[PDB]
Design an enzyme around this catalytic site. Structure first.
Site, PDB file in Angstrom:
ATOM      1  N   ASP A  49       0.815  -1.223   0.000  1.00 42.92           N
ATOM      2  CA  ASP A  49       0.000   0.000   0.000  1.00 42.92           C
ATOM      3  C   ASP A  49       0.844   1.267   0.000  1.00 42.92           C
ATOM      4  O   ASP A  49       0.485   2.241  -0.641  1.00 42.92           O
ATOM      5  CB  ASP A  49      -0.936   0.033   1.206  1.00 42.92           C
ATOM      6  CG  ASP A  49      -2.156  -0.851   1.040  1.00 42.92           C
ATOM      7  OD1 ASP A  49      -2.318  -1.524  -0.011  1.00 42.92           O
ATOM      8  OD2 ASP A  49      -2.970  -0.847   1.991  1.00 42.92           O
ATOM      9  N   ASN A  94      -4.232  -2.133  -4.142  1.00 43.43           N
ATOM     10  CA  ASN A  94      -5.371  -2.411  -3.273  1.00 43.43           C
ATOM     11  C   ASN A  94      -5.454  -1.367  -2.155  1.00 43.43           C
ATOM     12  O   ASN A  94      -6.154  -1.592  -1.172  1.00 43.43           O
ATOM     13  CB  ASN A  94      -5.204  -3.780  -2.603  1.00 43.43           C
ATOM     14  CG  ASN A  94      -5.206  -4.929  -3.598  1.00 43.43           C
ATOM     15  OD1 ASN A  94      -6.229  -5.250  -4.194  1.00 43.43           O
ATOM     16  ND2 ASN A  94      -4.051  -5.550  -3.776  1.00 43.43           N
ATOM     17  N   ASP A 313     -10.987  -3.762  11.863  1.00 43.30           N
ATOM     18  CA  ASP A 313      -9.917  -4.648  11.385  1.00 43.30           C
ATOM     19  C   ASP A 313      -9.402  -5.560  12.491  1.00 43.30           C
ATOM     20  O   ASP A 313      -9.329  -6.791  12.315  1.00 43.30           O
ATOM     21  CB  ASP A 313      -8.765  -3.833  10.800  1.00 43.30           C
ATOM     22  CG  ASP A 313      -9.071  -3.280   9.414  1.00 43.30           C
ATOM     23  OD1 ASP A 313      -8.309  -2.390   8.993  1.00 43.30           O
ATOM     24  OD2 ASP A 313     -10.021  -3.731   8.730  1.00 43.30           O
ATOM     25  N   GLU A 341     -11.175  -5.802   1.590  1.00 44.25           N
ATOM     26  CA  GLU A 341     -10.358  -6.616   0.678  1.00 44.25           C
ATOM     27  C   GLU A 341     -11.098  -7.811   0.109  1.00 44.25           C
ATOM     28  O   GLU A 341     -10.688  -8.356  -0.918  1.00 44.25           O
ATOM     29  CB  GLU A 341      -9.049  -7.051   1.337  1.00 44.25           C
ATOM     30  CG  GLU A 341      -8.046  -5.891   1.429  1.00 44.25           C
ATOM     31  CD  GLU A 341      -7.672  -5.323   0.056  1.00 44.25           C
ATOM     32  OE1 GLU A 341      -6.713  -5.834  -0.566  1.00 44.25           O
ATOM     33  OE2 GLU A 341      -8.343  -4.381  -0.410  1.00 44.25           O
ATOM     34  N   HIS A 385      -4.950  -9.713   3.066  1.00 43.35           N
ATOM     35  CA  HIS A 385      -3.882  -9.819   4.069  1.00 43.35           C
ATOM     36  C   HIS A 385      -4.384 -10.239   5.456  1.00 43.35           C
ATOM     37  O   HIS A 385      -3.732 -11.044   6.131  1.00 43.35           O
ATOM     38  CB  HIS A 385      -3.106  -8.476   4.171  1.00 43.35           C
ATOM     39  CG  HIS A 385      -3.955  -7.294   4.547  1.00 43.35           C
ATOM     40  ND1 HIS A 385      -3.453  -6.242   5.280  1.00 43.35           N
ATOM     41  CD2 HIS A 385      -5.250  -6.984   4.288  1.00 43.35           C
ATOM     42  CE1 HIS A 385      -4.398  -5.336   5.463  1.00 43.35           C
ATOM     43  NE2 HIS A 385      -5.500  -5.760   4.874  1.00 43.35           N
ATOM     44  N   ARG A 386      -5.541  -9.738   5.882  1.00 40.18           N
ATOM     45  CA  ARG A 386      -6.003 -10.096   7.223  1.00 40.18           C
ATOM     46  C   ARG A 386      -6.543 -11.514   7.322  1.00 40.18           C
ATOM     47  O   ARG A 386      -6.525 -12.101   8.404  1.00 40.18           O
ATOM     48  CB  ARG A 386      -7.012  -9.062   7.734  1.00 40.18           C
ATOM     49  CG  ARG A 386      -6.398  -7.666   7.751  1.00 40.18           C
ATOM     50  CD  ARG A 386      -7.115  -6.690   8.711  1.00 40.18           C
ATOM     51  NE  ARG A 386      -6.546  -5.372   8.452  1.00 40.18           N
ATOM     52  CZ  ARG A 386      -5.365  -4.945   8.891  1.00 40.18           C
ATOM     53  NH1 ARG A 386      -4.603  -5.688   9.708  1.00 40.18           N
ATOM     54  NH2 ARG A 386      -4.962  -3.731   8.535  1.00 40.18           N
ATOM     55  N   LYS A 411       0.272  -6.528   1.705  1.00 43.38           N
ATOM     56  CA  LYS A 411      -0.505  -5.298   1.626  1.00 43.38           C
ATOM     57  C   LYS A 411      -0.067  -4.364   2.766  1.00 43.38           C
ATOM     58  O   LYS A 411       0.109  -3.159   2.542  1.00 43.38           O
ATOM     59  CB  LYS A 411      -2.011  -5.593   1.742  1.00 43.38           C
ATOM     60  CG  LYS A 411      -2.891  -4.318   1.773  1.00 43.38           C
ATOM     61  CD  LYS A 411      -4.386  -4.650   1.925  1.00 43.38           C
ATOM     62  CE  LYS A 411      -5.230  -3.444   2.410  1.00 43.38           C
ATOM     63  NZ  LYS A 411      -5.302  -2.315   1.439  1.00 43.38           N
TER      64      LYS A 411
HETATM   65  O1  GG9 Z   1      -8.577   5.281   7.116  1.00 39.08           O
HETATM   66  C1  GG9 Z   1      -7.909   4.274   7.260  1.00 39.08           C
HETATM   67  O2  GG9 Z   1      -6.725   4.246   7.430  1.00 39.08           O
HETATM   68  C2  GG9 Z   1      -8.624   2.956   7.265  1.00 39.08           C
HETATM   69  C3  GG9 Z   1      -9.942   2.893   7.821  1.00 39.08           C
HETATM   70  C4  GG9 Z   1     -10.686   1.560   7.849  1.00 39.08           C
HETATM   71  O3  GG9 Z   1     -11.746   1.573   6.709  1.00 39.08           O
HETATM   72  P1  GG9 Z   1     -13.324   2.051   6.907  1.00 39.08           P
HETATM   73  O4  GG9 Z   1     -13.267   3.519   7.340  1.00 39.08           O
HETATM   74  O5  GG9 Z   1     -13.863   1.862   5.466  1.00 39.08           O
HETATM   75  O6  GG9 Z   1     -13.919   1.082   8.014  1.00 39.08           O
HETATM   76  C5  GG9 Z   1      -9.697   0.313   7.764  1.00 39.08           C
HETATM   77  O7  GG9 Z   1     -10.514  -0.868   7.739  1.00 39.08           O
HETATM   78  C6  GG9 Z   1      -8.797   0.447   6.502  1.00 39.08           C
HETATM   79  O8  GG9 Z   1      -7.951  -0.706   6.400  1.00 39.08           O
HETATM   80  C7  GG9 Z   1      -8.123  -1.730   5.388  1.00 39.08           C
HETATM   81  O9  GG9 Z   1      -7.466  -1.292   4.129  1.00 39.08           O
HETATM   82  P2  GG9 Z   1      -7.624  -0.025   3.088  1.00 39.08           P
HETATM   83  O10 GG9 Z   1      -6.619   0.974   3.582  1.00 39.08           O
HETATM   84  O11 GG9 Z   1      -9.072   0.525   3.116  1.00 39.08           O
HETATM   85  O12 GG9 Z   1      -7.273  -0.527   1.671  1.00 39.08           O
HETATM   86  C8  GG9 Z   1      -7.353  -2.946   5.837  1.00 39.08           C
HETATM   87  O13 GG9 Z   1      -6.137  -2.633   6.068  1.00 39.08           O
HETATM   88  O14 GG9 Z   1      -7.829  -4.088   5.989  1.00 39.08           O
HETATM   89  C9  GG9 Z   1      -9.612  -2.202   5.036  1.00 39.08           C
HETATM   90  F1  GG9 Z   1     -10.417  -1.225   4.794  1.00 39.08           F
HETATM   91  F2  GG9 Z   1      -9.623  -3.095   4.067  1.00 39.08           F
HETATM   92  C10 GG9 Z   1      -7.921   1.744   6.710  1.00 39.08           C
END
Ligand code: GG9
Length: 427
Positions: A49, A94, A313, A341, A385-386, A411
């Site tokens: 990422d 992603n 998460d 994901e 990843h999770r 990721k």
């Molecule tokens: O603002 C942020 O930093 C995040 C907020 C959350 O999303 P929501 O506000 O939609 O609930 C986390 O779940 C997200 O992490 C994930 O990844 P992404 O950064 O969105 O790709 C993850 O690591 O599993 C997840 F959303 F998948 C990262």
């Protein structure tokens, strides 16, 4: 199809120096790129990422250098909105923390840029953000399915009265908050109704303040932003260790410790996932807090029934830890697990049943009754990843487990399995 088989782990004990926070890392990089001056980030995360964000900044014209281990980054601020024309395509993999924030930020001024990513990213929603950006003046086109990436951005966000839906993702509000200060006119952002994942908005506001900007937060229902601002380099900035990544190791100790200490996060952390430790304490584990560490020592493990909206998460880690708890565990108010994901409610229920659990997959909750003893399974990971990190905990039992596509952990945590092995003991 690659796979990794984990042999049973008799006990875990030790210390893990956490990789950098992905949430903090990508926010800091974008704010540093927009800021005036040179920012030196340390403890930056090196993962897919972050690499996609760095590649996008390179394509947009931002200069920076990285240390040998890619955890130290010296960024030369652009001194204002980033720009590119000719429908330049930025491939964001992603990364939600690149896709949502850049979708908003690149609407400043005039641009002609396309944002896309891996197939799954084209299935993660972004309509609520696009709706808000358009109310503020932006010109945005959906190139494939309406309400999803890929997007062609042609600029025009000037500010004004903007409404945004916060019921699906906090990232849409996060993106608006980071962008609005640089818009020419003042902006009032109104939340339509509910706001999920509220702690991530606190992370965003903390980073914005570090880079010189504050806004008016009216009980998370409305945010008043003054336009015409500029972000400023804070000089050197230490990125917190990743509290979501920490969840796996703290849970490991609650199940099979021993004592596991994670460093890089502590009682003062801005990340909402440090509250995962409080859930382990509620289940029966012992937690110790420090300024730069959190540790967990095995006690007992009892089932819980809790609303997990504040830690979506890290809540996944409780779903596999529940396999080792006494009683039936229920995790509620986690609908957006379905739009990340992978559809995580479908995936988690499917894979948990494979190792023996009885599981009720609710529309926005999951109920888990553990089996008397776990059985072997080849775990599907859904390019998530999770899923790989959560199911690695199955090996803290008498049965081995095989994890498909173990590299998907990259990721956010390329070295995950090496770190889990570091605390795995035979005696
Ligand atoms: O603002 C942020 O930093 C995040 C907020 C959350 O999303 P929501 O506000 O939609 O609930 C986390 O779940 C997200 O992490 C994930 O990844 P992404 O950064 O969105 O790709 C993850 O690591 O599993 C997840 F959303 F998948 C990262």
């Amino acid at each position: 199809m690659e796979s990794l088989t984990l042999q049973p782990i008799a006990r875990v004990d030790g210390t893990i120096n956490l990789p950098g926070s992905k949430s903090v890392s990508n926010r800091a990089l974008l704010l540093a790129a927009l800021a005036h001056g040179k920012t030196v980030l340390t403890n930056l995360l090196d993962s897919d990422d972050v690499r996609h964000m760095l590649n996008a900044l390179t394509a947009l014209g931002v200069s920076y250098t990285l240390s040998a281990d890619r955890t130290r980054c010296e960024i030369i601020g652009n001194g204002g909105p980033l720009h590119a024309e000719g429908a330049l395509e930025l491939f964001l993999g992603n990364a939600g923390t690149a896709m949502r924030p850049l979708a908003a930020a690149l609407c400043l001024g005039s641009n002609d840029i396309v944002l896309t990513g891996e197939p799954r990213m084209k299935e993660r929603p972004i309509g609520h953000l696009v709706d808000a950006l358009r109310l503020g003046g932006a010109k945005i086109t959906y190139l494939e399915q309406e309400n999803y990436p890929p997007l062609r951005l042609q600029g025009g966000f000037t500010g004004g009265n903007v409404d945004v839906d916060g019921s699906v993702s906090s990232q849409f509000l996060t993106a608006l908050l980071m962008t609005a200060p640089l818009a020419p006119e003042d902006t009032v952002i109104r939340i339509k109704g509910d706001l999920v994942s509220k702690p991530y908005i606190d992370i965003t506001l903390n980073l914005m303040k570090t880079f010189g900007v504050e806004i008016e937060n009216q009980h998370y229902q409305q945010f008043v932003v003054k336009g015409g601002q500029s972000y400023q380099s804070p000089g050197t900035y230490l990125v917190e260790g990743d509290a979501s990544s920490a969840s796996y190791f703290l849970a490991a100790a609650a199940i099979k410790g021993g004592t596991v200490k994670v460093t890089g996060i502590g009682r003062n952390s801005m990340q909402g996932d440090i509250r995962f430790a409080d859930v382990l304490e509620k289940m029966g584990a012992t937690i110790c807090w420090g300024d730069d560490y959190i540790s967990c020592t095995r006690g007992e493990l009892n089932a819980i029934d809790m609303d997990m909206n504040h830690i979506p998460d890290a809540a996944m880690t409780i779903a596999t830890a529940a396999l080792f708890a006494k009683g039936t565990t229920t995790l509620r108010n986690i609908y957006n697990w379905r739009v990340k994901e992978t559809d995580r409610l479908f995936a988690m229920a499917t894979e948990l049943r494979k190792v023996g659990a009885e599981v009720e997959e609710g529309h926005d909750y999951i109920r888990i009754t553990p089996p008397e003893k776990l059985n072997f399974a080849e775990i599907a990971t859904y390019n998530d990843h999770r899923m790989a990190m959560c199911f690695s905990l199955v090996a803290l039992s008498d049965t081995p487990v095989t994890i498909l596509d173990p590299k998907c952990t990259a990721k956010t945590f390329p070295d995950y399995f090496e770190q889990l092995a570091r605390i795995s003991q035979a005696a």
